[PDB]
């Protein structure tokens, strides 16, 4: 990454073994559950395109997803080149391939990122990557919100957990449906409570 | 394209 | 977070992998036991709104709670906007959405937090979050203090542990009841000891 | 509201 | 905590995830064995009252002990207020509640701790806490020293371990008894060795 | 008192 | 490695125990799966030839691969000496053996790497090593892309994972084949979808 | 401990959670095997008497040993007071109790340790502690060197390991005996090899 | 160890708990496999003789090896004294015993190591130690290269692994033999391939 | 003595 | 060659 | 010798 030092200057630092291992382990354990994306974003704080490519490349398996990610990056890079049609010792303008780190060196990336004003190629590339990861989350979301219905004896709290877990995954890239998909006994209670009830009030009502 | 199937992220082209 | 450096200046730092993992693991293991809140507060020391949102987003599951948390934040943000009705290169005033980090950038958050005088948007947002987490603790508290009664052969110490564990959870958002809910043998001893006895003296008395 | 159901914490609006 | 930096100045630092986890884990594993207290003291080195409250609050369960601790802190705080009967931009004098961190802010705590001369509210509060923890150790000590007697075939070394483990817990808040509680065969040997023998000499004598 | 039953360590009063 | 310090100067640092252990563990667990190479590259960031040799030497077993690696390094070193035919207190020019760290001392390596302009012997040697590791990945790739065919009941997603995992390993040192190797039912669907379909669109189509 | 900083000055640092845990774990796993002493010494590098007392106090159990250690410290402290018979704002001379940290504060310890010339009370106390730990190792050494004899089918290497493991423990506070305690077949070979043989030559000779 | 600081000066640092534990664990797990030596060298980067003795002393068991190591150090120290036949406040010349850290203090070691020009006693002693460790590796090498022959159904790759693992251990202190020790079927193929074939080409040829 | 049985290391006397 | 069979990476020659 | 059997590495002599 690029971070501050004692002199207050932005300097490059090696990606740490802790960071490398944390990303490998979250992918292994969580695959492409929605919560993997904010973890990726947090672990790649201040990342250069090189660092982002390092993290993506350290992933073994999940290569269908990684290929979809390549497609998304290709699309975002093409759009950048469309919108940005591009001297000794002077800073050139970054193309899509430079932002994605295929045609740019680490030193060029540092030059752009620490310039005044800065050209944040690390943040731009992360945006494309996060866009692609969100599509993968949506692709691998197993259940439609329409099929999340409360069981006859399922506690309301457990149903609400399933409901909003499903909604999170499905929307990666409500109040009335929650009530409609509730079981007969809680639906009766929720109808009597009426519209305008908070989730807390609904959960309290069907708790007993 | 910037990236091709079966090639690493960051792979230089040509 | 924002922390001090050698120059004595407040500078932004990336949220560390240790911090990220610790929060994920405490939620996984402890769910919403009361002790999870002070851990959240400690792990989010010096946090920007962005850092707080990162921590909240890294949580997989528990989405009923996370939705209740959203409601609470919406309420606190609305109240802020009511109480605080809001130029080139000048610092704007933060709205509720800026404090919650939806409409503010990381650099704007750093600007407010490191200003003189500082506008501590990180601390304000944490206050709203902790408020919401306390409601969730209360919601998920399984037992009323009225149903914590000492068993016929339960050691007094174990009963007192259950009593004050329950009280902590129930009050998230006594001396006489402790005695009344004690079993016959210890109640007799505690009655003879009389009122004004410390917990230590009570536990010593029913220890044998 | 600031936050909506099924949307991440910090999600920009509009 | 408050620690030194490159400039040689006392600056506040966030309590680390390592510190937070270490304290949680020692309580979980060791409960209130005597060795937990010096660990608490070491882990809370340079701690503000806020840090001390953080550590205490992160503890799940053990709420009988935590309530006894509250009582002790209340007693020590009352005594402070008795002995210390308490202007724009000037430093006020800390009351008991300020030392315990209920009525003082983190910045006020830092002000007192880094003042010249310093008012070490962190150390004062830790003293009260350690006082309370010692009482809890004594309360939860299971065995009297009078009931530690060497078994007919128990090796002397194992007996001495039990003897001094028990003594440590019982005294939280000898030479002759060690001999008297020894079994017939070692007692005979220890009598012949006579008084004035070191523990090493006693253990050597009953080793065979 | 400074601390009350069932309230966290550091809990502000009033 | 060689890294920056507070003075902004490039100084040598000891390879850390975390780095050493991470490399040992990734080789133990992953052997020579493609993802081991970017991990090696990341863990050896800023590495001297000495550091690179340290990492390679800490590997127990896998000595067939390590011998192939030696061959590759010998070839790249020979080519360097062909292309670069090589005074008191002056900097000599590095030969192949110096780059590989057999005939150069750590101080000579630091001299070359921190010179102005710098002679990046660490990066040159890493290039040779990564070249050799890629050949080993190719050698140990178990399956040809021609033998990756979708099973009668294998979900399309699982097939695509196998397809691109195999392709990655085989190419270490497509769109039409993916369709041809699909099973009858998905092939029919993919034919109807037609050429020009993205991987995402293909996976969506055969998902049901 | 006391360590150097950027200004090149000796400043106090808190004992770290890593250090605290490492010492607790080595005692738990290894008890009082000889190798525990150099680990103690290494973990207590730059330690104040306070730090040394912290490490000793964090030990649960092993209280027979800890009591023997107290005796040894009492003896060494008495000798110090015999050899060293001891003004506003001036540095007093440390007595035995000050070195052992019973009657000295942390600030007094830092004063003595960082003085010019320095009075290394941390090193003096560690010397007494290491003296006591060595006696405990000797006390808990289970086997005499006289009873380490090579088994009829025991490989010579395994015998030599037992021989020198025993010797290390027994001497805490040879060449001919090694041969005499060897079994008939190796003894014959070692006799033929003759005196003046290195251990390596002896082990090579009895290897087959 | 001795390392650089912000001022660019060589200052002593305490050996870290991570370093201490890593060395203990590698010896426990790997005993004296060849890869343990480069790990020792890497973990002891910048080490003083004191640090090297600390690492060696923390090893429990393996005392036959440690005694052989003592012999080797004695030999190298004797040779140093032969080749180097050795005033108030002035630097004395280090003898063998000083390099091995028996007769030199930590401060004397730091004096020699940080002098201009530096007398690298840490590196000299490490050389002697590594020399001794290599002899131990050779001593504990279980198999001669002559007895590594490919099994009738053993894959060639697995045979080559055994071949070069054995060679590494045996040489601690080829092309034709590899072919001769191959089984009939691969030997035939390797003969047809002819001499001058790389290991990669040989492995490819016998892969099928 | 400096240290007494059953008392912590570093325990102040009197 | 720079490296020989059975010899460590970085092994000095001659 | 510098080191003797059964004595630690770094053990001072005499
Ligand atoms: Cl893969
Ligand atoms: Cl979720
Ligand atoms: Cl609790
Ligand atoms: Cl090997
Ligand atoms: Cl104990
Ligand atoms: Cl041993």
The residues that bridge with C4 in the sheet, in sequence order, are C10
CA A155 – ligand 3 centroid, Å: 24
To test the contact with chain H by mutation, choose from E14, E41, E42, E203 the residue with the greatest count of H C-beta atoms within 10 A, namely E42
Cβ neighbours, 10 Å, residue C16 = 20
Whole-angstrom Cα distance, residue G136 to residue G123?
20
Residues whose CB falls within 8 Å of the CB of residue H88, separated by 6 or more in sequence, listed in order: none
Give just the sign of the alpha carbon dihedral H81, H86, H89, H91. negative
Decide if G1-144 and G145-208 have a common fold: no
- Record: contact L9-I53, CB cut-off 8 A: yes
Whole-angstrom Cα distance, residue E65 to residue C199?
9
Phi-psi region at G61: left, alpha or beta (left = phi > 0; alpha = psi -120 to 50): left
Whole-angstrom Cα distance, residue H128 to residue H135?
11
Q: What is the 3-state secondary structure (H, E, C) of C165-199?
A: HHHHHHCCCCHHHHHHCCCHHHHHHHHHHCCCCCH
Q: State the pairing for strand pair A10-12/C2-4.
A: unpaired
The residues that bridge with I10 in the sheet, in sequence order, are I4
Whole-angstrom Cα distance, residue A174 to residue A34?
19
> C-alpha distances in angstroms, J10 versus C174, G110, H105, H125?
40, 48, 10, 11
Q: Examine chains K and H and say if they touch (3+ CB pairs below 8 A).
A: no
Report residue I208 as tokens: 């099928």
φ, ψ (nearest 5 deg) of residue C101: 80, 15
Q: How many residues does chain D have?
A: 14
SS3 C147: helix
Give the CB-side neighbour count of residue H114, counting CA atoms within 13 A: 18
Whole-angstrom Cα distance, residue I15 to residue I13?
6
Residues whose CB falls within 8 Å of the CB of residue G61, separated by 6 or more in sequence, listed in order: I161, I165
Buried b (16+ CB within 10 A) or exposed e, A7-23: eeebbbbbbbbebbbbb
φ, ψ (nearest 5 deg) of residue C47: -70, 140
Cβ A145 vs Cβ A163: under 8 Å: yes
- Record: contact K6-I38, CB cut-off 8 A: no
Give the DSSP H/E element, type plus range, for residue H187.
helix H184-193
SS3 C12: strand
Cβ H27 vs Cβ H43: under 8 Å: no
Which contacts (CB < 8 Å, 24+ apart) does range I180-185 have?
A: I181/I148, I181/I149, I181/I150, I182/I149, I182/I150, I182/I156, I182/I206, I183/I149, I183/I150, I183/I151, I183/I152, I183/I154, I183/I159
Method of determination is X-ray
Name which of C160, C201, C89, C73 is nearest C125 in CA terms: C73
Residues whose CB falls within 8 Å of the CB of residue G86, separated by 6 or more in sequence, listed in order: G92, G93, G95
Q: What is the 3-state secondary structure (H, E, C) of H45-75?
A: CCCCHHHHHHHHHCCCCCHHHHHHHHHHHHH
Q: What is the 3-state secondary structure (H, E, C) of chain G?
A: CEEECCCCCEEECCCCHHHHHHHHHHHHHHCCCCCHHHHHHHHCCCCCHHHHHHHHHCCCCCHHHHHHHHHHHHHHHHHHHHHCCCCCCCCCCCCHHHHCCCCCCHHHHHHHHCCCCCCCHHHHHHHHHHHHHHHHHHHHCCCCHHHCCCCCCCCHHHHHHHHHHHHHHHCCCCHHHHHHCCCHHHHHHHHHHCCCCCHHHHHHHHHC
Whole-angstrom Cα distance, residue E74 to residue F7?
13
> C-alpha distances in angstroms, D10 versus C13, C56, E137, J6?
19, 10, 46, 56
Whole-angstrom Cα distance, residue G125 to residue G49?
7
Q: How many residues does chain L have?
A: 14
CATH topology of domain H145-208: 1.10.1200
SS3 H174: coil
Buried b (16+ CB within 10 A) or exposed e, A110-125: bbbbeeeeebebbebb
Residues whose CB falls within 8 Å of the CB of residue E207, separated by 6 or more in sequence, listed in order: E156, E157
CATH topology of domain H1-144: Human Immunodeficiency Virus Type 1 Capsid Protein (1.10.375)
Whole-angstrom Cα distance, residue G92 to residue G89?
9
The residues that bridge with G2 in the sheet, in sequence order, are G12
Give the CB-side neighbour count of residue E206, counting CA atoms within 13 A: 31
Counting as contact any 3 or more CB pairs under 8 A, the partners of J are: E, H
Report residue K1 as tokens: 């060659």
Task: Determine if the peptide bond prior to B7 is cis (ω within 30°).
Answer: no
What are the residue boundaries of the structural domains of chain A, listed by start? 1-144, 145-208
The residue behind tokens 């405490």 is C26
The rounded Cα A108 to chain-centroid distance in angstroms is: 26
Buried b (16+ CB within 10 A) or exposed e, C169-192: bbbbeeeeebbebbbeebeebbee
Buried b (16+ CB within 10 A) or exposed e, C48-70: bbbbbbbbbbbbbbbbbbbbbbb
Give the CB-side neighbour count of residue A135, counting CA atoms within 13 A: 22
Whole-angstrom Cα distance, residue G38 to residue B9?
10
How near does any CA of chain E get to the CA of H17, in Å?
6
The residues that bridge with I2 in the sheet, in sequence order, are I12
Q: Examine chains I and K and say if they touch (3+ CB pairs below 8 A).
A: yes
Rg (CA), chain G: 23
Q: State the pairing for strand pair C10-12/E2-4.
A: unpaired
Cβ G92 vs Cβ G119: under 8 Å: no
> C-alpha distances in angstroms, H9 versus E6, G7, H56, I26?
10, 19, 28, 36
Whole-angstrom Cα distance, residue I157 to residue E194?
74
Report residue I58 as tokens: 């923390």
Whole-angstrom Cα distance, residue H120 to residue H115?
9
Counting as contact any 3 or more CB pairs under 8 A, the partners of K are: G, I
CA A61 – ligand 1 centroid, Å: 4
SS3 H3: strand
To test the contact with chain G by mutation, choose from B6, B8, B12 the residue with the greatest count of G C-beta atoms within 10 A, namely B6
Name which of H127, H125, H73, H117 is nearest H91 in CA terms: H117
∠ CA C97-C101-C107 to the nearest 5 degrees?
120
To test the contact with chain K by mutation, choose from I141, I161, I168 the residue with the greatest count of K C-beta atoms within 10 A, namely I168
The residue behind tokens 């983190």 is E106
């Amino acid at each position: 990454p690029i971070v501050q030092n004692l002199q207050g200057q932005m300097v490059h630092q090696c990606i740490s073994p802790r960071t490398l291992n944390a990303w490998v382990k979250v992918v292994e354990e969580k695959a492409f559950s929605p919560e993997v994306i904010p973890m990726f974003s947090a672990l790649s704080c201040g990342a250069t395109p090189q660092d982002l490519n390092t993290m993506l490349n350290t992933v073994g398996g999940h290569q269908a997803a990684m290929q979809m990610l390549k497609e998304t990056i290709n699309e975002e890079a093409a759009e950048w080149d469309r919108l940005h049609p591009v001297a000794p010792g002077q800073m050139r303008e970054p193309r899509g391939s430079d932002i994605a780190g295929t045609t740019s060196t680490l030193q060029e990336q540092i030059g752009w990122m620490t310039h005044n004003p800065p050209i944040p190629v690390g943040e731009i590339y992360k945006r494309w990557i996060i866009l692609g990861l969100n599509k993968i989350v949506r692709m691998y979301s197993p259940t439609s919100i329409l099929d999340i219905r409360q069981g006859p004896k399922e506690p309301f709290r457990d149903y609400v957990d399933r409901f909003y877990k499903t909604l999170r995954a499905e929307q990666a890239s409500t109040e009335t449906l929650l009530v409609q998909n509730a079981n007969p006994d809680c639906k009766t209670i929720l109808k009597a409570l009426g519209p305008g009830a908070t989730l807390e009030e609904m959960m309290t009502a069907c708790q007993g | 394209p910037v990236l091709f199937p079966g090639q690493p992220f960051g792979q230089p082209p040509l």
